[PDB]
Amino acid sequence: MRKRSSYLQKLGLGEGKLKRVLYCCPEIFTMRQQDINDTVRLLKEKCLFTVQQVTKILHSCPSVLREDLGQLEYKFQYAYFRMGIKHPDIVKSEYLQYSLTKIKQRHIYLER
Amino acid sequence: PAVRLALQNFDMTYSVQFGDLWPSIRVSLLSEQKYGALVNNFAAWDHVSAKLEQLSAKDFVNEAISHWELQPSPASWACSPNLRCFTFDRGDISRFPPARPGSLGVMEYYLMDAASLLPVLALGLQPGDIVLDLCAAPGGKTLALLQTGCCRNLAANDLSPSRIARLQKILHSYVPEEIRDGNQVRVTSWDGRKWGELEGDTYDRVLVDVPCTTDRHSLHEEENNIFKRSRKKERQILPVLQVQLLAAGLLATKPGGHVVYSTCSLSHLQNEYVVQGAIELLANQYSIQVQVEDLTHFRRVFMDTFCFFSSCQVGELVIPNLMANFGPMYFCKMRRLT
Numbered sequence: 001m002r003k004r005s006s007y008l009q010k011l012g013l014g015e016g017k018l019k020r021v022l023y024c025c026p027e028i029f030t031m032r033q034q035d036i037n038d039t040v041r042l043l044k045e046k047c048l049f050t051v052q053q054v055t056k057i058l059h060s061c062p063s064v065l066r067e068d069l070g071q072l073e074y075k076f077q078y079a080y081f082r083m084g085i086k087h088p089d090i091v092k093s094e095y096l097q098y099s100l101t102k103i104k105q106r107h108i109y110l111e112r
Numbered sequence: 113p114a115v116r117l118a119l120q121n122f123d124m125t126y127s128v129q130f131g132d133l134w135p136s137i138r139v140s141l142l143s144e145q146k147y148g149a150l151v152n153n154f155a156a157w158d159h160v161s162a163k164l165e166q167l168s169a170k171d172f173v174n175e176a177i178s179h180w181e182l183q184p185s186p187a188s189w190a191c192s193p194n195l196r197c198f199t200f201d202r203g204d205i206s207r208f209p210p211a212r213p214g215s216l217g218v219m220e221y222y223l224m225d226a227a228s229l230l231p232v233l234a235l236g237l238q239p240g241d242i243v244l245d246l247c248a249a250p251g252g253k254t255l256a257l258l259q260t261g262c263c264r265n266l267a268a269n270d271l272s273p274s275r276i277a278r279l280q281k282i283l284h285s286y287v288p289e290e291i292r293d294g295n296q297v298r299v300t301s302w303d304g305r306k307w308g309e310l311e312g313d314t315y316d317r318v319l320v321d322v323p324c325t326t327d328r329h330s331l332h333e334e335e336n337n338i339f340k341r342s343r344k345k346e347r348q349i350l351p352v353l354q355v356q357l358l359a360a361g362l363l364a365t366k367p368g369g370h371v372v373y374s375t376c377s378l379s380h381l382q383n384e385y386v387v388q389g390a391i392e393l394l395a396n397q398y399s400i401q402v403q404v405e406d407l408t409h410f411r412r413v414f415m416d417t418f419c420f421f422s423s424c425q426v427g428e429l430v431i432p433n434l435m436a437n438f439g440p441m442y443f444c445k446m447r448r449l450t
């Protein structure tokens with residue numbers, strides 16, 4: 001538990017940021033750290049989020065840890081390419097917590 | 113691109129015309145349209161009607177006629193008869209399966225925009241009428257005009273010989289050889305604007321379903337799109353052609369006869385401006401008086417199935433809505449007096 005508490009601290013989830021994470025995703029202390037590393041790796045190098053943004057994503061959208069790496073990549077792509085949302089507004093709005101279905105439903109309705 | 117130019121042009125025009133109603137129309141034009149199954153009366157309509165009822169579909173034309181008495185003359189005297197067209201309930205998006213051949217080797221029903229039947233219904237065919245469909249291809253409304261069993265004679269015309277092939281395909285698919293080879297139906301391919309000279313004062317009923325910017329189709333198909341950059345002049349002179357065709361229809365109508373003008377566009381420049389423009393042209397150039405007939409009772413009766421833009425000055429307009437996604441359909445009934 002201490003070893004995971006340390007991993008999460010260097011990941012930026014210190015200073016009480018893990019309050020929201022434990023409420024939605026209490027599995028984070030049981031999870032494999034390479035599965036958590038895979039999610040931060042996908043966001044940082046494939047979705048081009050900065051370290052500060054990835055920390056905020058984990059804090060506000062803990063659901064992304066339980067998400068498939070493909071589904072999560074397509075969900076990001078929908079905001080960046082299809083909707084035209086820059087990386088800061090994706091993070092600030094807590095966009096990645098919602099389902100692609102809800103996102104598509106509301107975006108395409110407004111678009112049309 | 114042409115699909116985007118069409119939408120760009122509709123955003124500019126139709127946001128001004130409909131105002132806060134334009135979004136509900138815009139989403140409907142950019143979504144799947146609702147179809148009605150026009151029953152083929154040559155193909156034993158009673159079994160087809162019963163089969164279509166199993167799907168939870170209902171004949172909107174019969175529903176309408178039932179309430180003709182509620183809020184002058186029988187429905188048959190005002191509204192073209194024997195047209196059975198099934199649609200699913202308001203809000204239902206079910207699709208009809210493709211029709212198959214039946215009773216006389218003819219297709220059981222024809223799938224179409226249910227609103228396309230309203231100009232034919234509104235035209236008010238009576239038994240023994242000489243009828244003209246001036247811009248008939250591909251034949252959806254021609255088919256409905258035949259289904260009434262009122263046409264002594266039916267002239268179906270269209271300038272395009274390629275679209276006439278599709279009309280002939282529908283007539284061969286839906287109508288038995290006994291009727292489509294006789295003196296009851298005549299398919300021509302000629303300029304409709306020349307009908308004032310050839311066949312003047314001949315027809316009792318005339319349908320002028322003019323070529324327009326086909327608003328819904330223009331947003332789906334990129335090939336042969338009226339909003340292409342090369343077709344800029346053709347699109348701008350479109351209200352001239354539409355008046356020329358309506359005036360020709362009126363000149364081919366007998367004095368006392370009736371004409372229905374229609375489009376599948378929301379634009380007032382193609383709708384009310386063409387009706388007023390053709391009525392003026394005949395009063396000035398030919399000294400012929402044409403009266404626009406009120407379709408308020410007709411509208412009110414059919415409001416249960418379609419969304420109408422009730423702010424129409426002349427004629428009526430069915431606007432598409434997700435609850436009843438029946439494409440733009442403008443229509444105006446007229447009577448030639450002199």
Ligand SMILES: C[S@@+](CC[C@H](N)C(=O)[O-])C[C@H]1O[C@@H](n2cnc3c(N)ncnc32)[C@H](O)[C@@H]1O
Pocket residue numbers: 228246247248249250251252253254269270271272275302303304305321322323324357
């Ligand atoms: C909206 S379509 C008619 C649809 C048809 N009544 C139906 O319900 O299937 C308009 C038609 O006008 C035809 N057209 C164009 N210019 C014409 C002209 N000068 N005379 C006659 N038909 C013409 C086009 O070829 C086109 O088929």
